Design a protein around this ligand. Structure first.
Ligand SMILES: Nc1ncnc2c1ncn2[C@@H]1O[C@H](COP(=O)(O)OP(=O)(O)OP(O)(O)=S)[C@@H](O)[C@H]1O
Ligand SMILES: Nc1ncnc2c1ncn2[C@@H]1O[C@H](COP(=O)(O)OP(=O)(O)OP(O)(O)=S)[C@@H](O)[C@H]1O
Lengths: 372, 54, 100, 54, 109, 324
């Protein structure tokens, strides 16, 4: 009768798990006690190192002082400009740390949603390789440019109808290369002041200078990149100011290594000539019959359909439609099927979607403007 | 501004200019500029002035 | 025989809820008496379309006007009271004011 | 000196600055406050008050 | 002195070449950094620049921004009243006519 | 059974270990948690950024910077760079996170008046009934049905019609019949002198919608500042384009989320840009035809029902003798 054995075994294992979790929690509690004891550390700025101990500083949000480091903050790399922390009591430097990251950068560096690789949207069959010849050329390896020597460019410029795939091209390249896509669109930089936009721009340039394989994305540069007229509104003067600053930053003084730009907008004609000098205006070309049908297919893979969808019917039913367009086509097909809730899809519903999208095309006008 | 021997009204960087005494051994012909003076926190007692800053 | 002047210009006050507090003050002083008159003007200066700005400023108008919506007609309506908000122009209306 | 010592006898209390309110929380009122201009204050009142007279 | 680089140029490149072959206390800046919100920010910037320049060594310094910065059109009472005021004021008051021993020959283009 | 004694010894040891865990946890927690509550009770501030080489900095209500090597009483995932947090003034350890990332009238954009109204009232809008239901109440609840088939739910509707066919009536219908997240939007309330308002508005509203998935955003006369682009020589302002393009690359360009419920209850759509209607923004574009002959009389009797009527009223003659 070993009932005591297994019973005490279960009780002791339960008490073991319980006491382990609760003692680890008591340890975390003493740890939070230490965190209280580990007082916050004001962040000031050393204005200049007078001597190897007298570091002339000013509080980032207060007066100025001259104190020293704790023991081993490695003054070697510590020079006027680097961000440090200070003592609670004596203001002495307790820890230096990397510089700020200016929140807006994270807003254009951390939103990136992972998605499909580089085979979703059609019409860019030859563009897929074109984009790769600049998109993985430095990313894969620059050592080829020791045999050859050619200095790496910074990027190029896209165009085409709005949201018709340039957005989706950027999404595909992001979710395909997957290294350092800084997804910036620069749509609301200038609120009402002058140098703030250029200021954050300089910050982004430095940030990119930190890490090597940085990737710069810039869509809808319309009201930021733009063209420099005579003195317009104060805002116009600020825009042209940051333009020249951005144009002066391009050349700067030191080569920003291993960073690549992505200039994009609906209307890249808006850019000033002094700026439009971007190896070439790569285009997402109009999906034609082959491309239209390719995207139409890819929009209809995971349907509860059958071997019924009439392909050439929708093909000739079309007058130019991109991946987003024929995505809407398959969607309105499944919707006019869901009108009365048809879980399957017949190409009849494809034709009803053709009706709806042709009705939408009535709301189009003047659908092209050439840049440069 | 200086008033008497080793004592001067000195602009602060905290928010309150003060008229404090200074270390007398400082060369009297060096407290003329609004240069980077340095004092104690509470005492606000000038120890020396530094030429450069910012 | 009742006529109480409350001009929307004076109603341009810079204290949050103080406008709404005056709303309740006037609305209940009116309900004490009867056949009253309350004459809000400069609704051009007050506003008819719910303009919103991130300025963090004219939102005492927001709370005040929602309190007004609450306390004018329905929830002890004006009845023997007339609370009048009028304009120079029906230019900026709102789907909340055309109510009979 | 008609009351020149009662004012020196009222002294046992010095509290309650301006302290404007902002809003309040739930599961406890936790009314939110700014004193004059300094900052926002999600306070918990002195329970010897009314949870709605604030 | 002065330069101007149009399409297919390299005027700035020349400046950086000289920046190499120069071997003294030269500081580089951009005039765009002079436009902010509060009073005299960029003006006081260039002022203290002049001070520290004539202080360290009257050898060399250079700044690179002319367009939308050195604006002779002082005449539009719509935008940049105090802004263009302080901009062009710093520009001309720092011109000083000249100073003849400082920051020898900044350029722009 | 000789091992039973050793098992009883080990069980007494496990009981003493559970009691010791009880002591070290609860007894010490009296003190620790009581101090935490004190900081909470007895007496709101911003996160700056994150390091873990855990290592975070504090931005105060008094706008002051304070690093810490260890955060402590909160979780870094519950945080991010630039986060409001109710923090110990003294310890400079974050106590709790502040989930009030919402503006004043950007939050007031969620309205709750919601007067009731059904499709029976509106006369002459039968197809409006059908399509409004199918594209409002079903994307509100039957989101999976489109996924069952596997294409997409509808993506935006365009409510157009001359003044006296009604489009905001569809807003009121979506309000009454559907009880999802009310969040209006209109045209005139976009007019601003402060240049650059709709950007932060749209971003924060998108985050809040991520919190509030049944995100109904009825934008009456959405064509107001979302308009056909212009091209001239200094003839025209820009901030409209700032906010418009910002919303373009906010909604479109990224963030696929079927929570989208966006509608334009304007009068005309000819002033709208081709950048505003293609395939994911306002998918369907159905019109508000003039009440034909007796749809007018239907609306009329909807007015002519509550108010007491002498039944000697044939609405047919009425509707006929006032055509168009
Ligand atoms: N021959 C060249 N070889 C390599 N890079 C060159 C050459 N010429 C110009 N560049 C590029 O242009 C920059 C330096 O020339 P700059 O004089 O700054 O051009 P620019 O006259 O300012 O024309 P902008 O500013 O681009 S409109 C460097 O960053 C180079 O990348
Ligand atoms: N089927 C209908 N049911 C109710 N009212 C209708 C109908 N058709 C036309 N109307 C008229 O149209 C008005 C409805 O306008 P709404 O769109 O709800 O609000 P609104 O502010 O006028 O928006 P507009 O003018 O259409 S852009 C009512 O006053 C009705 O008299």
């Amino acid at each position: 009768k070993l009932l005591e054995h297994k019973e005490i075994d279960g009780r002791l294992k339960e008490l073991r798990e319980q006491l382990k979790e609760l003692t680890k929690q008591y340890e975390k509690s003493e740890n939070d006690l230490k965190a209280l004891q580990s007082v916050g550390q004001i962040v000031g700025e050393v204005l200049k190192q007078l001597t190897e101990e007298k570091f002339i500083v000013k509080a980032t949000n207060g007066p100025r002082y001259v104190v020293g480091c704790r023991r081993q903050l490695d003054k070697s790399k510590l020079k006027p400009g680097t961000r440090v922390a200070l003592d609670m009591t004596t203001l002495t430097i307790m820890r230096y740390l990397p510089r700020e990251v200016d929140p807006l950068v994270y807003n254009m560096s951390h939103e990136d949603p992972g998605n499909v690789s580089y085979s979703e949207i059609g019409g860019l069959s030859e563009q897929i390789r074109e984009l790769r010849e600049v998109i993985e050329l430095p990313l894969t390896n620059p050592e080829l440019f020791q045999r050859v020597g050619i200095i790496p460019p910074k990027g190029c410029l896209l165009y085409g109808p709005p949201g018709t795939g340039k957005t989706l091209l950027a999404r595909a390249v992001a979710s395909q290369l997957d290294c350092n896509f800084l997804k910036v669109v620069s749509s609301s930089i200038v609120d009402k002041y002058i140098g703030e936009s250029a200021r954050l721009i300089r910050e982004m340039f430095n940030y990119a200078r930190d890490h090597q394989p940085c990737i710069i994305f810039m869509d809808e540069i319309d009201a930021i990149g733009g063209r420099r007229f005579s003195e317009g509104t104060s805002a116009d003067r600020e825009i042209q100011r940051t333009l020249m600053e951005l144009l002066n930053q391009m050349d700067g003084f030191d080569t920003l290594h291993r960073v690549k730009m992505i200039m994009a907008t609906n209307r890249p004609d808006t850019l000033d000539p002094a700026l439009l000098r971007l190896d070439r205006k790569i285009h997402i070309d109009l999906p034609n019959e082959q491309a239209r049908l390719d995207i139409l297919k890819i929009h209809a893979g995971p349907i509860t359909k059958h071997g019924e969808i009439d392909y050439e019917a929708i093909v000739k039913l079309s007058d130019g439609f991109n991946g987003a367009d024929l995505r809407n086509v398959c969607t309105e097909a499944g919707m006019f099927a869901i009108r009365a809730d048809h879980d399957f899809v017949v190409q009849e519903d494809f034709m009803k979607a053709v009706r709806k999208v042709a009705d939408s095309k009535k709301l189009e006008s003047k659908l092209d403007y050439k840049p440069v | 501004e200086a008033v008497d021997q080793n004592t001067a009204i000195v602009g602060s960087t905290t928010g309150s200019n003060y008229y404090v005494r200074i270390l007398s051994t400082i060369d009297r012909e060096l407290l003329k500029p609004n240069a980077s003076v340095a004092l104690h926190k509470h005492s606000n007692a000038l120890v020396d002035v530094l030429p450069p800053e910012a | 025989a009742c006529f109480i002047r409350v001009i929307g210009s004076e109603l341009v006050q810079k204290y949050v809820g103080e406008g709404a507090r005056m709303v309740r003050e006037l609305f209940e002083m009116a309900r004490t008496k009867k056949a009253c008159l309350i004459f809000f003007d400069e609704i051009d200066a007050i506003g008819g379309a719910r303009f919103d700005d991130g300025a963090g400023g004219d939102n005492e108008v927001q709370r005040t006007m929602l309190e007004l919506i609450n306390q004018l007609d329905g929830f002890d309506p004006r009845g023997n009271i007339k609370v009048l908000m009028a304009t120079n122009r029906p230019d900026t209306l709102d789907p909340a004011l055309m109510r009979p | 000196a008609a009351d020149k010592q009662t004012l020196q006898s009222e002294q046992p209390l010095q509290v309650a600055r301006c302290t404007k309110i902002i809003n309040a929380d739930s599961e406890d009122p936790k009314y939110i406050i700014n004193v004059k201009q300094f900052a926002k204050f999600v306070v918990d009142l002195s329970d010897q008050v009314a949870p709605t007279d604030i | 002195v002065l330069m101007y680089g149009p399409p297919g140029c390299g005027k700035t490149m020349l400046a950086k070449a000289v920046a190499h072959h120069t071997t003294a206390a030269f500081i580089r800046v951009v005039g765009s950094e002079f436009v902010q919100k509060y009073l005299g920010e960029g003006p006081r910037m260039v002022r203290d620049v002049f001070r520290l320049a004539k202080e360290n060594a009257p050898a060399i310094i250079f700044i690179d921004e002319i367009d939308a910065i050195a604006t002779k059109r002082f005449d539009a009472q719509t935008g940049a009243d105090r802004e263009v005021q302080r901009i062009l004021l710093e520009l001309l008051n720092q011109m000083d006519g000249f100073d003849q021993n400082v920051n020898v020959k900044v350029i722009m283009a | 059974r000789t091992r039973l004694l050793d098992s009883e010894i080990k069980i007494m040891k496990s009981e003493v270990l559970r009691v010791t865990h009880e002591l070290q946890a609860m007894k010490d927690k009296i003190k620790e948690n009581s101090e935490k509550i004190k900081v909470n009770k007895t007496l709101v501030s911003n996160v700056i950024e994150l390091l873990d080489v855990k290592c975070a900095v504090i931005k105060t209500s008094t706008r002051q910077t304070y690093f810490l090597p260890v955060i402590g009483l909160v979780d870094a995932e519950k945080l991010k760079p630039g986060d409001l947090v109710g923090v110990n003034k003294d310890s400079y350890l974050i106590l709790e996170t502040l989930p009030t990332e919402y503006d004043s009238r950007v939050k007031a954009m969620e309205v709750d008046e919601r007067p009731t109204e059904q499709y029976s009232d509106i006369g002459g809008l039968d197809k409006q009934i059908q399509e409004l239901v199918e594209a409002i109440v079903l994307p509100m609840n039957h989101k999976e049905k489109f996924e069952n088939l596997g294409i997409q739910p509808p993506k935006g509707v365009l409510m157009y019609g001359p003044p006296g066919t009604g489009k905001t009536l569809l807003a009121r219908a979506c309000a009454a019949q559907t009880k999802a997240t009310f969040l209006k939007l209109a045209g005139p309330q976009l007019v601003q002198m402060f240049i650059g308002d709709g950007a932060k508005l749209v971003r924060d509203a998108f985050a809040l919608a991520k919190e509030k998935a049944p995100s109904i955003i009825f934008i009456d006369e959405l064509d107001a500042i979302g308009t056909k682009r212009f091209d001239s020589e200094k003839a025209g302002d820009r901030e409209v384009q700032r906010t418009m393009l910002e919303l373009l690359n906010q909604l479109d360009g990224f963030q696929p989320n079927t929570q989208v419920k966006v509608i334009a209850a304007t009068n005309r759509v000819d002033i709208l840009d081709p950048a505003l209607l293609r395939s994911g923004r306002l998918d369907r574009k159905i019109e508000f035809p003039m009440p034909n002959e007796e749809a007018r009389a239907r609306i009329m009797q909807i007015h002519s029902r509550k108010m007491n009527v002498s039944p000697d009223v044939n609405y047919e003659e009425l509707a006929r003798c006032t055509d168009d």
